[PDB]
Ligand binder design. Structure first.
Ligand SMILES: OC[C@H]1O[C@@H](O[C@@H]2[C@@H](O)[C@H](O[C@@H]3[C@@H](O)[C@H](O)O[C@H](CO)[C@H]3O)O[C@H](CO)[C@H]2O)[C@H](O)[C@@H](O)[C@@H]1O
Length: 260
């Protein structure tokens, strides 16, 4: 089937039956880790389902040799997601200096394997002083440049996560770095009782269609990934899958939305 190169899912796909269901409309997935779920090891998903897996270095706890070996043995992998929400204490929780210290290892992987670096994956944060992703990125750039005679860190794409209204405004703010984006988690989880709360499937479908239209349209958005395959409880009706190998109404909707 012809489908959007952009359209992904943020979910540890484990079942081949879940790929059948998703592959109609989904080009790619990731699972916040350097390798796909073990269940998929002896399945040619690239060839049968026309889906690719994008590996991720979640924080500085990195087996460089093992990742390099995997990437070199899988030359069709062209992108490496790096650093999952460093400015969130409940995620990578990396200071700007800690991320700058890791970065040369990631540049060496890029130089050795050809992969482009997609990250850090930013959000509005909880790390002291670094709620604003612009503050965190500015400090990271300054830390890296300090340690490398003024050179900026290699960033092929920035990544972004967003669970509210205003995702286009956040991309506009972050366009100050002059880098294109992957939006590697999104949904609308607004909860406050202000009229905008997403408390029905109809309202999540409405926001999914609005956000997908905008992401497909933007020339500086290469890829996006919906959160998520399955979750429970699911108060904002974010799940694309139900039983093994079965789409929800939202899943069927997502995979059939138009694209660029
Ligand atoms: O790599 C070692 C590193 O692993 C860390 O554990 C992470 C998980 O926290 C992460 O979990 C994902 C979340 O980041 C994301 O928000 O939601 C998804 C879906 O629920 C989670 O799977 O998954 C990755 C990959 O499996 C794990 O690396 C430990 O926190 C950390 O201390 C350790 O250094």
């Amino acid at each position: 089937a012809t489908k959007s190169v952009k359209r992904g899912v943020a979910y540890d796909v484990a079942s081949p039956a879940d790929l059948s269901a998703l592959s109609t409309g989904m080009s790619w997935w990731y699972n916040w880790s350097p390798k796909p779920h073990d269940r998929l090891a002896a399945y040619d998903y690239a060839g049968q389902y026309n889906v690719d897996f994008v590996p991720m270095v979640w924080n500085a706890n990195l087996d460089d040799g093992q990742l390099k070996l995997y990437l070199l043995a899988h030359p069709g992998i062209r992108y490496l997601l790096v650093i999952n929400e460093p400015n969130l204490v409940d995620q990578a929780n990396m200071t700007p200096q800690a991320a700058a210290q890791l970065w040369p290892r990631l540049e060496q992987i890029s130089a050795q394997t050809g992969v482009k670096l997609v990250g850090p994956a930013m959000n509005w944060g909880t790390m002291t002083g670094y709620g604003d992703p612009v503050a965190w990125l500015d400090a990271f750039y300054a830390a890296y440049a300090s340690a490398h005679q003024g050179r900026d860190p290699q960033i092929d794409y920035l990544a972004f996560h967003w669970y509210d209204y205003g995702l286009s405004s956040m991309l506009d703010r972050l366009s100050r770095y002059g880098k294109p984006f992957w939006v590697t988690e999104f949904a609308n989880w607004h909860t406050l009782d202000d009229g905008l709360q997403i408390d029905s499937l109809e309202k999540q479908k409405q926001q999914m269609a609005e956000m997908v239209t905008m992401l497909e349209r933007r020339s500086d958005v290469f890829r996006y990934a919906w959160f998520t395959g399955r979750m429970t409880p699911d108060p904002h009706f974010s799940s694309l899958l139900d039983a093994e190998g079965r789409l929800t109404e939202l899943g069927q909707y997502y995979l059939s939305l138009p694209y660029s």
